[PDB]
Amino acid sequence: LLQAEKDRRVLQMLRENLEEEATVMKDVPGWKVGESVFHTTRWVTPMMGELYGLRASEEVLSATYGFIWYT
Amino acid sequence: GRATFQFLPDEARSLPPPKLTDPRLAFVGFLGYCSGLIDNAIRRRPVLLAGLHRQLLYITSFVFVGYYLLKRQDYMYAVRDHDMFSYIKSHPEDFPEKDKKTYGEVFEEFHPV
Amino acid sequence: SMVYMNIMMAFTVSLVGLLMYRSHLMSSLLCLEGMMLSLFVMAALTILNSHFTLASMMPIILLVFAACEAALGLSLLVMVSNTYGTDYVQNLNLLQ
Amino acid sequence: VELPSLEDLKVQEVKVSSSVLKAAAHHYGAQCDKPNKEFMLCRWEEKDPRRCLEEGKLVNQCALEFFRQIKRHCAEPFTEYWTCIDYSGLQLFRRCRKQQAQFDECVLDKLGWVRPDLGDLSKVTKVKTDRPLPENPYHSRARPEPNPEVEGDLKPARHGSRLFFWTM
Amino acid sequence: PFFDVQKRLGVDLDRWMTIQSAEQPHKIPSRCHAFEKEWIECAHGIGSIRAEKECKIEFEDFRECLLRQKTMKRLHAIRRQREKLIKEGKYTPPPH
Amino acid sequence: VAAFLKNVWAKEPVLVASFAIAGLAVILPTLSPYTKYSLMINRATPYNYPVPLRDDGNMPDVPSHPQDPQGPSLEWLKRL
Amino acid sequence: NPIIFIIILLTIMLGTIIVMISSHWLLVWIGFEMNMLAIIPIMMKNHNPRATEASTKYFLTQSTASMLLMMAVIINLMFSGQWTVMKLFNPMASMLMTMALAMKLGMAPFHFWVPEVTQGIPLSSGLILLTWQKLAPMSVLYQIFPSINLNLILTLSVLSILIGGWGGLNQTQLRKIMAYSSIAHMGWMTAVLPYNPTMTLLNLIIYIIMTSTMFTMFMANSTTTTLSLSHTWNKTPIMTVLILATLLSMGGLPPLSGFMPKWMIIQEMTKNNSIILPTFMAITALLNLYFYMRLTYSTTLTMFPSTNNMKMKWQFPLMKKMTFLPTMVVLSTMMLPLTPMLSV
Amino acid sequence: MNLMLALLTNFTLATLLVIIAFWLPQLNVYSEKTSPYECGFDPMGSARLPFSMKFFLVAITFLLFDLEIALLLPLPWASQTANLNTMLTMALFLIILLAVSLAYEWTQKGLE
Amino acid sequence: MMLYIVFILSVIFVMGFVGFSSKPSPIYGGLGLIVSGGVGCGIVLNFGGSFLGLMVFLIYLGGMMVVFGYTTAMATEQYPEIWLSNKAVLGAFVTGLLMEFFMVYYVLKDKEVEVVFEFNGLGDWVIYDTGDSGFFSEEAMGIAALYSYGTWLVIVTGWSLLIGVVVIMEIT
């Protein structure tokens, strides 16, 4: 149960970090919408920079460093 | 080759083996037979034939060892070949059959003095 | 990312004129016994940020000699300055 | 890449604290096991938790009616039970041991449940095969082709070592 | 010369710590774990001299799983699609 | 030799208390049958998550419902 | 004291057996990390004010030599993250391997050392043990063998067999003269190494024997060249035909076995159609011979027997296995096209 | 994030309190004569600190017994395993490898 | 207490060295280490590895260095002046200090300059974690205790130390 809550939280999380990306600019020397940095195709757990963008304010700082240095 | 860190594998059964009276095995330990004679001479033996118990046990050692080592050498040159033909046999595209031409054909240079 | 270019510029601590020289050998031997932590930390990240879970002991074994051995070579530095009282790399006597 | 839309989302998450969520949590799974073990096999057996969202709404569903069940019959002993365990640090289970019966008085009795002491979450189980058991494993591109072998026969050397002269 | 005794007789000297996917005592993976069993599957019956000019595909992404070298650049290049235009419209997002 | 063992115990009765405990901790682990219980407990603690296998035909044991008769007896400890 | 000297002197080869037997980059660190730990006391035994200003110029010159390596192990732990022992997957590794590993062997540079240690170790007994440390490293280079920048391992070679050659012509002490021309024979075996790396070992064994049988001969009292003059009219003349039956064979002339490595090596280094490399090596080991001639004009020319020097006693050293070697250090040429197919 | 708040709090009381003790009367207007009368009751004392060995070894001697009781440290985490015999058979080796390393040197401590 | 509290340690660390990597009168050499070692054990205590950090204090920084400092009373330097002593140490310093600074200045002072220093982005700690996880002692070096699989790794280190003393019982 606990996990079936998370997997939905990231797929929700990518879409907003994509759908709210592809509507930033569509540039002629830009990128295709949601390409792959790899050749191979399957689901590979994303890097922190994927979920949180350059947003980089606080709730990030409480995510990556959240567990370490304290309750 | 395979069965690594083996002096020789089981596949060496099919080789002659290199039995005695070959000049080398005789020669092997000859260079020891001129070794034994040294063994005295360094210390001022001064025998030049001293106890036959030192003046032998060399000749016993070399030819045994020289023998027991030649058994694998001859092997190795066999596994070398064996892995060659079996490659030369396949890929005949890399191995042409040359034609036959006598001399009604070739010109040389032709530069006499 | 960036933490791999520091610490690396740190591991050019070698700098060798200051690895054998100049005198007060104890300064030379020092930058050696701290040449570690450039080997250690650098190898305490790459092991860690990706979960190897197994080589994790290796960091421990990078000290256990780095202290054991570098503490040997201290010993000689008594024998040099026992017979002298000043280390002073400037002792050349055996020549070529 | 293909990601599903924003939809089949915003579903009903069970919203409760982490103290109550461990209050029952125990009678919970031992008696259900209808989607959930099966839902594991829609992950472990085939990865990429994108292709498999469906039972996620089944396993999330089982909980909904569970906590919706318990609210009808007895919430009074439960509400008082997860208060003590919520009195806190570490959330031990050995402080509330006394009240463990009061919650479980009629639950195992009235609505007919059982205390699954040590047999839960062990005894690696089975489910069933309904979905196609997938071939075409995760990435799985191509072979490629190996080396033909060599055995034949073993000759001795042909003419003897062919080095420079060195007959034999 | 590399004798490889641990092949002949039975013991394991090391051979376990060696690669990124072997055991990990409680069975916990690495991040790029899943690309090992992909890339070793490629070159095994190979003799490795054609490997370099044969596989090379299953290797490169594996080198780009490890360092995230590219995805970090296509990422750093969203900071140029937005955050030069902040004043020019589409603040993006609406919070929340 | 027992006169020796009493004539080092009139002089250095210190390390002798270490040897006396040096062995007697090496020997005993090969004796008392309480051990090898110790290896059974320590194997059964589920650090990880059990993953249910696929059942087609057998399925030797271990039904869907866990509390049904499934597998070994770990409850020899609960009474212990 | 006497027991441990066989515990120490055993742990060395145990230091170099974990080197040749291992799969795993860590162990080839620990492996020749415990030589620089376990070599040092041997230098000492008579506790003099050279050995201790020797092994300390050795120590910190094999300390970094190691400690760079551990930096070029952990590079390709980043890239590819697979240890083991194979090509190094990244050029900053290898170039930081091979030219920081040349410190233990020392090659063309990185030798202001080999003469500063081998000279003036008060212990000449051996000092035959500095034929191990030739044998630990090579048992890496044979494995890593298909990764080198290839413009280097020759460039440390060809600047070596030259620089170790000229080094000695100016020398008298004969612990140095062996120190020099032991950089030389590190010029042939790592110049080959990318082409067919066996027919290196061939030069490696023929080397361990010949330099071995020198020292065991240099052990009676012999130290300085002009103490090898007082040799033939004093100790024994059957000694002098020996020291002339090797020192000549060691630079090599075809009826001996010293000619055996070259004769085979050039079969290899041409056939790869590099014929402008080997002459310059082939031709430079020439003036590597003019040590030995002019060493050998010391002992057969009856030069001023020492003084009234009367040694009426016999000998009690350990000649152990000297009564063999210069029948295998000389006469083996007639025997073997084995060495290319025997160790292979 | 509150650890460093609990450290630089501590020093800053201490690194304060030096100045309010050492420094404050240090600029007071009293006499404080520069005479070389200081360095009590060994008035002059002109020498180098000589090497005194049995001072030295008690440094080295420790440093090595120190290491392995870092190696020895992860016993109580390793008491939870699968096959445990490779522990008791192995764990007890380090110790005896420590205790041996005593007995040898124990022939000569000297005056320690 | 921003996201840069890691980058601010290392560039103190990198500056921790150059103090004793030149020529400081080595009773201040230590004070170039125990800062560097300290900040060093600082950096490692992020990333989640903890036990392995808190040891460097115990086995090295605390335990080892004191021997390095318990001598340099036996090799004891002369009381010439020390530290600022001879006019030479200062010349070698800054050009190092600026060399990362001038590096750190336009390494990224702008969008990118240029390529080799431009493939390192900054500021979110892009890689510094992944997802979530379960727990084993932590996950990572929480299980650093292998007297299981590791054995031939110990028994060399176990045996290589035992000889450490014999060598040093002699030359002493």
Neighbouring chains of C at 3+ CB pairs under 8 Å are: E, G, H, I
- Per the DSSP assignment, residues forming a β-bridge with A47 are I130
Which chains have at least 3 CB atom pairs separated by less than 8 Å from chain I?
A, C, E, G, H
Q: What is the DSSP letter of G290?
A: T
* I151 and H85 Cβ atoms separated by less than 8 Å: no
Task: Residue G61: name the closest of G36, G90, G37, G28 by CA.
Answer: G36
Touch between chain I and chain G: 3 or more Cβ pairs under 8 Å: yes
Q: What is the DSSP letter of E71?
A: H
Cβ-contact G25, C58 below 8 angstroms: no
* Cβ <8 Å between I156 and G18: yes
Coil, strand or helix at B62? helix
The answer to whether D158 contacts B14, with C-beta atoms less than 8 Å apart, is no
CB burial string F8-37: b at 16+ within 10 A, e below: eeeeeeeeeeeeeeeeeeeeeeeeeeeeee
CA distances (Å), origin I145, targets B18, C25, C68, G225, H69: 56, 38, 21, 60, 14
Q: Do C43 and C62 contact (CB within 8 A), yes or no?
A: yes
Q: Running DSSP on this structure, what letter comes out for residue I130?
A: B
I127, I151, I163, I168: best mutation site toward chain G, by most G Cβ within 10 Å?
I163
Between CA D122 and CA F62 the distance in angstroms is 10
Q: How wide is the angle at C-alpha H41 spanned by C-alphas H38 and H42, nearest 5°?
A: 95
Cβ pair F38:H88 closer than 8 A: no
Other beta carbons less than 10 A from residue A34's beta carbon: 14
Report the C-alpha gap between G209 and G325 in whole angstroms. 7
Q: Residue D139: closest CA among chain E residues belongs to which residue?
A: E38
Per the structure, the count of domains in chain H is: 1
Task: Mention every residue, 6+ apart, whose C-beta is less than 8 A from residue G237.
Answer: none
Cβ contacts below 8 Å, chain F against chain H, sum to 11
Both tokens assigned to E5: 């005794």
Shortest alpha-carbon distance between residue C96 and chain I (Å): 26
Look-up of token digits 């220093």: I117
Q: What is the DSSP letter of E21?
A: S
- E residues 10..49 contacting C (CB < 8 A): 16-17, 20, 22-25, 28-32
Rounded CA gap, G98 and G87, in Å? 12
**C8 Cβ partners below 8 Å, 6+ apart?**
C38, C42
Q: How far is I162 from chain E (nearest CA, A)?
A: 20
Beta partners for residue A55, in sequence order: none
Q: What burial class does residue D45 get, using C-beta atoms within 10 Å of its C-beta: 0-12 exposed, 13-18 middle, 19+ buried?
A: middle
| Beta-carbon count within 10 A of B60 CB | 11
List the single residue in H80, H88, H92 with the smallest CB-CB distance to F42: H80
Report yes or no: D148 at the B interface, CB cutoff 8 Å: yes
Distances in Å between the Cα of E72 and the Cα atoms of A52, A55, A63, E65 are 13, 15, 19, 11
* Omega of the bond leading into B46 within 30 degrees of 0 (cis): yes
D3 touching B, CB under 8 A?
Answer: no
CB E78 to CB A39 under 8 A?
A: no
- Look up the domain containing H32 and give its range: 7-107
Q: Indicate the domain borders of chain C.
A: 2-84
Distances (CA, A) of F65 to C94, D42, D67, D126: 84, 19, 21, 9
Say whether the G–C interface has 3 or more Cβ pairs within 8 Å.
Answer: yes
Q: Rounded CA gap, A10 and A4, in Å?
A: 11
- Identify the residue among G37, G55, G58, G78 best suited for mutation to test binding to I, counting I beta carbons within 10 A and taking the highest: G37
Among all chains, which residue has been given the structure tokens 């009368």?
A: H37
In whole angstroms, what is the distance from residue G131 CA to residue G185 CA? 12
Looking at the structure of chain I, the number of domains it has is: 1
Task: State how far the Cα of F28 lies from the Cα of G307, in Å rounded to an integer.
Answer: 75
Whether H48 maps to a domain, the answer reads yes
Locate the chain F residue with the closest alpha carbon to E26.
F48
Whether H102 is covered by a domain: the verdict is: yes
Query: Quick check: helix, strand or coil at residue F42?
Result: coil
Q: What is the DSSP string of chain A?
A: -HHHHHHHHHHHHHHHHHHHHHTT---TTS--TT--SSSS-S--PPBHHHHS-S--SSTTHHHHTTSTT--
Q: How far is CA G256 from the centre of its chain?
A: 20
Through-space distance between the first and last CA atoms of chain F, rounded to whole angstroms: 46
* Experimental determination approach used: cryo-EM
CB I48 within 8 A of CB H29: no
User: For residues D77 and G242, what is the distance between their CA atoms, to the nearest angstrom?
Assistant: 105
CB–CB of E58 and D141 under 8 A? Answer: yes
Cβ distance of D124 and F51 shorter than 8 Å: yes
DSSP G225-282: GGGSSSSTTTT-HHHHHHHTTTHHHHH--TTSSTTHHHHHHHHHHTTTT--TTHHHHH
State how far the alpha carbon of G218 is from the alpha carbons of G63, G231, G235, G236, I96, in Å: 31, 11, 12, 13, 52
Residue H11 lies inside a defined structural domain of this protein: yes
- Rounded to 5 degrees, what are φ and ψ at I79? -85, 40
Q: Measured between alpha carbons, how far is residue A36 from residues A43, E29, E35, E61 in Å? A: 11, 23, 16, 11
Q: Domain limits at I28?
A: 4-169
Establish if F38 touches chain H: CB-CB under 8 angstroms: yes
Q: Is E61 on the interface with A (CB under 8 A)?
A: yes
Interatomic CA distance for residues I129 and I143, integer angstroms? 19
Alpha carbons within 13 angstroms on the beta-carbon side of residue F46 total: 11
Do H94 and H71 meet the contact criterion of CB atoms below 8 Å apart? yes
Cα–Cα distance list, D148 to B86, F10, G152 (Å)? 10, 80, 37
Distance, in Å, from the CA atom of H109 to the CA atom of G203, rounded to the nearest integer, reads: 50
**H and I in touch (3+ CB pairs within 8 angstroms):** yes
Residue G94 CB neighbour total at 10 angstroms: 22
Tell me the C-alpha distance between I17 and F67, whole Å. Answer: 63
Nearest CA among I157, I24, C93, G299 for reference residue H67 = I157
Residue G190's alpha-carbon distances to D81, G30, G137, G138, in angstroms, are 79, 24, 11, 9
First to last CA, chain G: 42
How many Å apart are CA G31 and CA I165, to the nearest integer?
19
Would you say G55 and G131 are in contact if contact means Cβ atoms under 8 Å apart? no
Distance, in angstroms, between C48 CA and closest chain H CA?
19
Nearest to A63 by CA among A3, A10, A8: A10
- State the residue for tokens 């309904």: D130
Could you tell me which of G136, G143, G152, G124 has the C-alpha nearest to residue G50? Answer: G124
Q: Is residue G200 within 8 Å of residue G135, measured between CB atoms?
A: no
Contact G285, G292 (CB under 8 A): no
I residues 133..172 contacting G (CB < 8 A): 153, 156-157, 160, 163-164, 166-167, 170-171
Is H99 exposed, middle or buried (CB count within 10 Å of its CB: 0-12, 13-18, 19+)?
exposed
Flag whether C touches I (3+ CB pairs, 8 A cutoff): yes
Residue labelled with tokens 């050749």:
A39
> From the list I111, I121, I148, which residue is nearest E72 (CB)?
I121
Q: Which chains touch H (3 or more CB pairs under 8 A)?
A: A, C, F, I
Residue I163 dihedral angles phi and psi, to the nearest 5° = -85, -15
Alpha helices in chain G (DSSP H): 4-20, 25-38, 40-44, 51-73, 75-78, 91-101, 114-118, 138-144, 155-158, 160-163, 165-168, 174-179, 185-192, 201-218, 237-243, 247-251, 260-269, 278-284, 296-299, 339-342
Nearest to I154 among H56, H59, H90 (CB): H90
Q: Which CATH number characterizes residue I56's domain?
A: 1.20.120.1200
- Are the Cβ atoms of G8 and I167 closer than 8 angstroms? yes
Could you tell me which residues come within 8 angstroms of residue A31 by beta carbon, excluding any fewer than 6 positions away? E74, E77
Q: Does the residue H112 lie in any domain?
A: no
Question: Is the CB of residue B95 less than 8 Å from the CB of residue B88?
Answer: yes
Contacts of G213 (CB under 8 A, 6+ apart): G246, G322, G325, G326, G329
The alpha-carbon gap from G337 to the nearest alpha carbon of chain D, in Å, equals 7
Nearest CA in chain E to G201: E1
Residue H66, in any domain of the structure: yes
Alpha helices in I56-88 (DSSP H): 63-70
Residue F53, SS3 per DSSP? strand
DSSP three-state, residue I136: strand
| Cβ pairs B/G, distance under 8 A | 45
Check if the beta carbon of residue G68 is closer than 8 Å to that of residue G83.
no
Residue D124: alpha-carbon gap to chain centroid: 11
Closest in B24, B31, B42 to G323, CB measured: B42
Burial of I106 (0-12, 13-18, 19+ CB in 10 A): exposed
Which residue bears the tokens 């040449």? C35
Cα D30 from Cα D26, distance rounded (Å): 7
Name the burial class of residue E94, with classes exposed (0-12), middle (13-18) and buried (19+) by CB atoms within 10 angstroms of its CB. Answer: exposed
Q: Is D44 on the interface with F (CB under 8 A)?
A: yes
Instruction: State both tokens at I126.
Output: 């892009």
Report the alpha-carbon distance of residue E71 to residue A47 in Å, rounded: 9
Domain C2-84: which CATH number of 3.40.50.740, 1.10.620.20, 3.20.20.60, 1.10.287.3510: 1.10.287.3510
3-state secondary structure of I138: strand
Q: How far is F27 from chain D (nearest CA, A)?
A: 35
Cβ-proximal residues to G145 (8 Å cutoff; 6+ apart), any chain: G193, G194, G197
Gap between the Cα atoms of I36 and C13, Å rounded: 12
Long-range CB contacts for residues I142-145, cutoff 8 Å, separation at least 24: I142/I51, I143/C53, I143/C56, I143/E25, I143/E26, I143/H77, I144/C56, I144/C57, I144/C60, I144/H74, I144/H77, I144/I51, I144/I52, I145/H74, I145/H75, I145/H77, I145/H78
CA distance H49 to H52: 9
- Residue E93: is the preceding peptide bond cis (ω within 30°)? yes
E25 contacts in I (CB within 8 Å)?
A: 143, 146, 148-149
The answer to the question of residue H2 being in a domain is no
Residue owning tokens 């309750």: A71
Q: Which residues in chain F are contacts of E27 at CB distance < 8 A?
A: 48
CA atoms within 13 A on the CB side of H35: 6
Report if residue H1 sits inside a domain: no
CB B68 within 8 A of CB B25: no
The residue type found at G133 is Q
Partner-chain residue, chosen from C58, C70, C96, that has the shortest CB–CB distance to G26: C58
- Per the CB < 8 A criterion, the answer to whether C51 and E25 are in contact is no
Counting every residue, how long is chain B? 113
Nearest CB to H104; choose among I74, I158, I166: I166
| H68: chain I residues, CB-CB within 8 Å | 158, 161
Contact assessment for residue A66 and residue E89, using Cβ atoms and an 8 Å cutoff: no
Chains near D (3 or more Cβ pairs under 8 Å) = A, B, E, F, G
